[PDB]
């Protein structure tokens, strides 16, 4: 990760971003759920219990 050897503004650098939502769905295939607790609360009980 190399620092940029030229400094430019261009209304492209130094903008205060606002992060809202970062998905962590199942990338091994098609993701259907966000978190493990949300997946368990949606699906309910299974044969594991």
């Amino acid at each position: 990760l190399r620092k940029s050897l030229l400094v430019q503004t261009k209304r492209r650098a130094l903008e205060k971003i606002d992060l809202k939502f970062i998905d962590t769905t199942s990338k091994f295939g098609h993701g259907r759920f966000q978190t493990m607790e949300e997946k368990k609360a949606f699906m309910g009980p299974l044969k594991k219990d």
């Binding site: 990760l1 209304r11 903008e15 205060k16 971003i17 606002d18 992060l19 809202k20 939502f21 970062i22 998905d23 962590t24 990338k27």
Partner: protein, 49 residues
């Protein structure tokens, strides 16, 4: 790996402004760099030595 970010865009004068934009975003794991060596360079008329 790679993820999304639902990001608010504070860039005026566009259709993008005041709206949520989802972008392709990578993740790079960066462990802290442990320092070992010091290398000095002399400026030669063929380059650096």
């Amino acid at each position: 790996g790679m993820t999304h970010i639902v990001r608010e865009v504070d860039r005026p004068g566009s259709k993008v402004n005041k709206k949520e934009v989802v972008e392709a975003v990578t993740i790079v794991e960066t462990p802290p760099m442990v320092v070992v060596g010091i290398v000095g360079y002399v400026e030669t008329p063929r380059g650096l030595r």
